[PDB]
Amino acid sequence: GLMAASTEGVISNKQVILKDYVTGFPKESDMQLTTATTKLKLPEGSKGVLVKNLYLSCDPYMRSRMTKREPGASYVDSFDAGSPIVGYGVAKVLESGDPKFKKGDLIWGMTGWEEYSVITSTESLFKIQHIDVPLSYYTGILGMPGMTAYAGFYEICNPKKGETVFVSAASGAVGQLVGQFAKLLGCYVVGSAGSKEKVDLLKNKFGFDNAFNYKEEPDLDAALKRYFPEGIDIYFENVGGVMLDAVLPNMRVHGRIAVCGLISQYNIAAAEGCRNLMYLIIKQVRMQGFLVFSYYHLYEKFLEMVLPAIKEGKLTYVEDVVEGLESAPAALIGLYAGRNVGKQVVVVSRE
């Protein structure tokens, strides 16, 4: 077989399309791998960038964008059926209408699930300077998940030396950093995760004081009392559901719950009830939700702290890396089954 090159400079652009809006849990077959065509040229008048995508993030929030809604009651618009999935990634600039960015610069920000994207505005892109770390880190510890852990722990939890900290989904992109931040502060830290592998990772890689497999614990209250005989000062909440109900009676007086996520609720049409809210009164607890995008003014301050800590080996990170856009649908769905061990990354292209 033989394929002539295009005399109009057309090349192939593989894409992951959302075929149609999703009800309940997403399936691989809700997405379609396709091959489009592109002339690698920016639209006339573009103030944006034409990029080659290198790495894509799989992030839990992305399921919410697969449900059809009008712009509102969500912080962000639905995906468009028939168009590529969009999400955070790391890309190389091919052409720019903004002279801040030149060919060969590396960026992170919202991009398409495709080999090549046009991003119409640069105002929400970050130009990468420090490349003495794996570039995939700018989807996790040096991107949106790392900023989430930094904001949620240091700005919402009011953490103090000697406090007790519980983290759910603790081996994941956000949780693995919260627990390290807490350990470095001098807190007692425990995490919950969904397998022996992830429990062992918490104790051995991340230095949590203890951890347990929630899927093997018939009695979550008894598990939390095993590790917190005098209660929990801070709950960093990533999951919601039965774990939140089990936590509430185990909070300390003036305890805090940072409500980062509620991933156990993301795929069911009607959420489970939280039943132990009386303990917010009895223990005088502050339960506070937050959105990372309200804290990006702190990003440069965050990088000034975390880059040298990674270099010094004070902070570490575990990524789950899968190869190719072809892998991306299964990697995204896998978040809701705990398939990922650490932060889920898709490698579209290393260069």
What DSSP string describes 136-172?
GGGGTTTSHHHHHHHIIIIIIS---TT-EEEESSTTS
CB of 84 to Na ion, least distance (A): 39
Binding status of residue 296 toward a second copy by CB under 8 A: no
Kindly tell me which of 48 and 241 has the beta carbon lying closer to a second copy. 241
State yes or no: residue 240 binds a second copy (CB under 8 A): yes
Q: In Å, what is the CA distance from 334 to each residue of 63, 171, 255, 340?
A: 11, 15, 33, 6
Among the listed residues 270, 297, 312, 351, the single contact to a second copy using CB under 8 A: 270
Window 245-264: contact mask with a second copy (x via CB under 8 A): ----x---------xxxx--
| Cα atoms in the 13 Å half-sphere on the side-chain side of 90 | 25
Rounded to 5°, the CA angle 304-298-140 comes to: 70
Among 340, 345, 346, 347, binds ligand NAP (CB under 6 A): 340
Q: 180, 154 in Cβ contact below 8 A?
A: no
Contact between residue 165 and residue 247 where contact means Cβ atoms under 8 Å apart: no
Positions in 62-81 near a second copy (CB under 8 A): 73-75
In the complex, what is the shortest distance from the CB of residue 244 to a second copy, in angstroms, rounded to a whole number?
8
* Calpha distance 129→328 (Å, rounded): 27
Residue pair 261/231 in contact by the 8 Å Cβ criterion: no
Q: What angle do CA 254, 256, 257 make, to 5 degrees?
A: 150
Q: Name the one range near a second copy by CB under 8 A: 42-50, 81-89, 288-296, 321-329.
A: 288-296
**Which of ligand NAP, a second copy, Na ion, none binds 294 (CB below 5-8 Å, type-dependent)?**
a second copy
Choose which of 21, 61, 279, 296 interacts with ligand NAP (CB under 6 A).
Answer: 61
Residue in 26, 48, 134, 175 binding ligand NAP, rule: CB under 6 A: 175
- Under the binding rule (CB under 8 A), the answer on residue 10 touching a second copy is no
Residues of this chain that bind a second copy (CB under 8 A): 73-75, 240, 244, 249, 259-262, 265, 270-291, 294
